[PDB]
Write a protein that binds this ligand. Structure first.
Ligand SMILES: Cc1cc2nc3c(=O)[nH]c(=O)nc-3n(C[C@H](O)[C@H](O)[C@H](O)COP(=O)(O)OP(=O)(O)OC[C@H]3O[C@@H](n4cnc5c(N)ncnc54)[C@H](O)[C@@H]3O)c2cc1C
Ligand SMILES: Cc1cc2nc3c(=O)[nH]c(=O)nc-3n(C[C@H](O)[C@H](O)[C@H](O)COP(=O)(O)OP(=O)(O)OC[C@H]3O[C@@H](n4cnc5c(N)ncnc54)[C@H](O)[C@@H]3O)c2cc1C
Ligand SMILES: [Cl-]
Ligand SMILES: [Cl-]
Ligand SMILES: [Cl-]
Ligand SMILES: [Cl-]
Lengths: 437, 437
């Protein structure tokens, strides 16, 4: 019916590759346009187990397993500052806000058939996923950037694909914005809404032969994600395995802390890192295999995540902050849910907003909990570990850390978090008070 | 000067990736068009050391070393039929045509700084090379097939690039045909000349946990290329390491032997392989990780390997037969030499045949020796091992097996081979006679 494709995916990352796999697997004729030549370096390494049902559902899990990514059986938090001595009657703290751990297997998660998910080289990871989408029948273009999308009619779109400085017109019944922090349709259509509260900022690189025992004694916990709290305001470091020897390490903080630093990005990394001697010395002993990258300006909302002949997924739709290592999960799950709506949209031949309403509701609520949970971490700071460790909140907290964010249940935790916040907020005498953020 | 690129490379294999690396490294604005999404399966695994000077010269060697390809320190030939007992005064045969070996380090090769080259997964190999070409500045398109090249004027060409069924016009001062056995410009311009003498044919796949000690006792020789002669006319099997566990195994023979077999490709493999019990049982014990592939119709010449605003390289220019595992070497060296001419062609702004004359002469002579050497192997059959093992011819033979085929020296070996051929040819009494092909 003079359309080149039913669907045209913009961007070939996790959000794009997955959407393409869900469509080609369901018989829909789609295409992915990736502007970069893969493999391409990308921050965002530590997966969360809500990825695996999707990875399984699309048929790519064993190809991913053959990549031999370091397994992520769980997640840790450490702080040089053990907290207040009182502990406000919190049932279990084995080290007084100093250390906290959690195994992903401690809660059963529908779809998960595993004790572990992966920490990935995001270059390798994304190639394998796009290759896979390719192998399922999806047409994939690399080195071909999408300049703009012409919105002619409901169920009728043209896409401006460029090859350097040479345009090509691609007719489609719709587009999928699976762009990154780039955000093609959010900028073009003016949907992008920069976050008012969040002004966080990240600096990271890779570190070879980085002794992961710098973070813990036990060899069972060596390949967990470690989130090292730093004494600076709203500051923490990630430690993520990439290979057996290579670790990815990034500081995250308020830009206000960096810009007042009067330092280059490299120097700020070491200076913030030097506030925790074990981390610093392990990093100094290890080998930088990559120059330091900045990641900034990444906290943004989106006025509309769907429309007539368009839907936004993954980072093209939203990003908050990388604490809980959940963004790739959202990429795959926003790609899963929006595909369910798209597969029916081509069947019904009905690409107006109404056909994508189920995705809109599902994602917005999935962003809400994800968003709220990130805010309350920064509000609690090191006091977050009291909730992680306490049985009354532990597996309710694990639910979120696992990425089970889509269901429409409230998640009573997030109010119980809010109450104990408000109890301390109110009272500046409160012993927990100076540890807040 | 309203050209999108100085050069447009057709195809993103070893020949294409390399050309692109040589051009981008020398400041020339080029582009590679690969029709497939990488990684993509490709036969042609065992490299020959004439690749390494090029791999080094383009700056990709360490990226290749990080791929951890099995090292190829040398090459072996085995036959269940030990030959005639006479040995016609050949100075050294340690097993009577039964076994022969050679180490690549036994002759010094200019550019080689190594005792070994690699056996590669050609999927991985080609991605790393095209990525590399990318990183040097070359623009790379994947999923974009080149339909045809319009030859307007010397130094002025248009290329028809398609995206499914959607054309795009790309202006260029010239094109490089780095296509495969596909052969775009050879078919379009009618340069393709199917080989009259060679009608060889190959069937192969991968085999996991394939005990490489089936071929030899010693653990030093376990990862050599092994060429197992079979009793059938012009028949031999390759054994090439791909990983620590995976081996690539292919039978090569006259199609006449297959077509008279009355068997499917799978069945012929096992039947020809069963003529050598150690090989068969090691293969039967191992795990097929891939279905069997046919490779046929690959012996072809080319009327013209260069022209006004065009040059053919690698398999787009020629292929003979895969005995000496030398085709990827030709891909890289034809890409090296033709780049030397192209780099000057853009400098001089002169893209007529005359500017590529140095490549034409160099390749044609490099094909000649490569071609002759392949013919005399098939003529000698198992008697080839007498030349491999004898000091008088050993390192002169190694020169060819190493891929030092470009120089314009005659290579006295190939006549000395021819004489001893003609001595046996003439006389059907001759003891060596029934072992010829
Ligand atoms: C500092 C930091 C740390 C993080 N840490 C983690 C972590 O530990 N764990 C985790 O799960 N997540 C993490 N994230 C989030 C994660 O990186 C993203 O959520 C994830 O990459 C989203 O995938 P995506 O496909 O939606 O977007 P991307 O992965 O960014 O993919 C977008 C793709 O679209 C392409 N593209 C863009 N524009 C165009 C165009 N016009 N035409 C064609 N192609 C285009 C891009 O080249 C890119 O390949 C982190 C983020 C930051 C900033
Ligand atoms: C049975 C067999 C065994 C072999 N064994 C060996 C061995 O052991 N060792 C060895 O060194 N060599 C071997 N070879 C030879 C080797 O495979 C080739 O010589 C080598 O692949 C040549 O590289 P190339 O880039 O010139 O062509 P290719 O590697 O074939 O690359 C060509 C590329 O161009 C692309 N292309 C084609 N048409 C178009 C178009 N219109 N637009 C855009 N892109 C296009 C293709 O998709 C492909 O990616 C063997 C060959 C055969 C048949
Ligand atoms: Cl410490
Ligand atoms: Cl995240
Ligand atoms: Cl045998
Ligand atoms: Cl070859």
């Amino acid at each position: 019916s003079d359309h080149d494709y039913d669907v045209v995916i913009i961007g070939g990352g996790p959000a794009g590759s997955t959407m393409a796999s869900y469509l080609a697997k369901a018989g829909v004729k789609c295409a992915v346009f990736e502007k970069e030549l893969f493999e391409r370096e990308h921050v965002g390494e530590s997966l969360v187990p809500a990825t695996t049902p999707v990875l399984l559902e699309i048929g790519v899990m064993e190809k991913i397993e053959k990549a031999n990514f370091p397994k992520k059986f769980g997640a840790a938090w450490t702080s040089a500052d053990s907290g207040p001595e009182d502990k406000m009657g919190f049932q279990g703290l084995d080290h007084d806000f100093r250390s906290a751990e959690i195994l992903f297997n401690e809660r059963k998660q529908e779809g998960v058939d595993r004790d572990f998910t992966f920490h990935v080289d995001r270059g390798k990871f994304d190639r394998i996923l796009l290759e896979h989408a390719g192998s399922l029948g999806a047409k994939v273009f690399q080195g071909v950037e999408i300049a703009d999308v012409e919105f002619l009619s409901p169920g009728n779109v043209i896409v401006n694909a460029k090859l350097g400085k040479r345009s090509v017109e691609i007719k489609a019944k719709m587009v999928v914005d699976a762009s990154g922090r780039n955000v093609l349709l959010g900028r073009r259509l003016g949907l992008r809404e920069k976050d008012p509260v969040f002004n966080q900022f990240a600096i990271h690189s890779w570190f070879d032969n980085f002794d992961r025992k710098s973070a813990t004694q036990s060899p069972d916990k060596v390949d967990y994600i470690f989130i090292h709290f730093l004494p600076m305001t709203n500051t923490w470091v990630w430690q993520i395995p990439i290979t057996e020897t290579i670790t990815s390490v990034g500081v995250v903080t308020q830009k206000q802390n960096y810009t007042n630093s009067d330092l280059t990005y490299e120097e700020f990394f070491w200076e913030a890192v030097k506030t925790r001697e074990n981390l610093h010395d392990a990093l100094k002993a290890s080998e930088q295999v990559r120059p330091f990258k900045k990641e900034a300006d990444y906290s943004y909302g989106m006025k509309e995540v769907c429309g007539d002949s368009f839907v936004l997924i993954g980072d093209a739709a939203r990003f908050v902050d990388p604490i809980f290592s959940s963004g790739v999960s959202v990429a795959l799950n926003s790609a899963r849910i929006a595909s369910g709506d798209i597969i029916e949209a081509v069947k019904n031949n009905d690409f107006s907003k109404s056909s994508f309403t189920h995705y809109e509701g599902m994602i917005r609520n999935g962003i809400k909990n994800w968003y709220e949970f990130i805010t309350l971490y920064y509000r609690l700071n090191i006091l977050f570990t009291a909730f992680v460790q306490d049985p009354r909140y532990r597996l309710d907290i694990l639910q979120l850390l696992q990425g089970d964010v889509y269901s429409g249940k409230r998640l009573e935790v997030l109010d119980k978090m809010r109450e104990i916040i408000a109890a301390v907020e109110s009272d500046p005498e409160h012993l927990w008070h100076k540890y807040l953020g």
